[PDB]
């Protein structure tokens, strides 16, 4: 592997990562590809995807929002990164040479061309993967975990659910919390309607 054009085949752009924010096997299909993480002025450094991590900071990336990190490493220098800093630009000649030099200095053997050839098909086959298994439930659970509930049309459904939970729960503290949450939701809905 000595060309940039062949190396850009497995480059995971910022638009493709938005479709696997909650798909399983994220540590298998993603581990192996390279990304053009932006460091910051326009200089970029290619880093290897060692694995997957989870950050405690929740940030929104356009439409969706994820808090998962990405444990990268460039030769020897490693630290936590985020999926929002990745750029969509392809590996330039200067950055390609910089990455080659970093790999040679770090002693990490360059991945063989056949390795990239057989790895680039992983993303292609995962993209057209039929969601026949019970993965949609986990996806929706993860999405709703961070995504706040009131938005946008489920206000009445959420209010009914809160009332039902409060009625079912015989505890005093839980009842008070449910009543307070219901009152807050009703007040927010009234304010939105008035606006």
């Amino acid at each position: 592997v000595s060309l940039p054009e062949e190396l850009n085949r497995v480059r995971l752009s910022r638009h493709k990562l938005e479709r696997w924010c909650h798909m399983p096997f994220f540590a298998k299909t993603v581990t192996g590809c390279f990304v053009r993480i932006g460091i910051g002025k326009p200089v970029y450094r290619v880093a290897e995807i060692t694995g997957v991590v989870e950050t405690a900071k929740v940030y929104q990336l356009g439409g969706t929002r994820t808090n998962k990190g990405l444990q990268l490493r460039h030769g020897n220098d490693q630290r936590v990164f985020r999926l929002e800093f990745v750029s969509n630009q392809e590996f330039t000649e200067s950055e390609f040479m910089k990455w080659k030099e970093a790999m040679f200095s770090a002693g990490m053997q360059l991945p063989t061309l056949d390795e990239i050839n057989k790895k680039e098909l992983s993303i292609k086959e995962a993209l057209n993967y039929k969601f026949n298994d019970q993965d949609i439930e986990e996806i929706v659970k993860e999405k709703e975990r961070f995504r706040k509930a009131p938005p946008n049309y489920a206000m009445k459904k959420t209010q009914l659910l809160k009332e039902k939970a409060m009625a079912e729960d015989l505890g005093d503290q839980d009842k008070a919390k449910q009543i307070q949450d219901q009152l807050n939701e009703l007040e927010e809905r009234a304010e939105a309607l008035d606006r």
């Binding site: 026949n132 949609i136 709703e144 049309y153 489920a154």
Partner: protein
């Protein structure tokens, strides 16, 4: 390359649903979703 995009019932969020797949919203999870308007030349005469 048309994955037959749909519109969630209550989320009013787009979804990509292909054949032999469950009909549910990508988030929350509902069982209702409508289609999107055609792209054809919808031309009326203001008569």
């Amino acid at each position: 390359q048309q994955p037959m995009i749909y519109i969630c019932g209550e989320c009013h969020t787009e979804n990509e649903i292909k054949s032999r797949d469950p009909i549910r919203c990508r988030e929350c999870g509902y069982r209702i979703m409508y289609k999107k308007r055609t792209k054809r030349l919808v031309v009326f005469d203001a008569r």
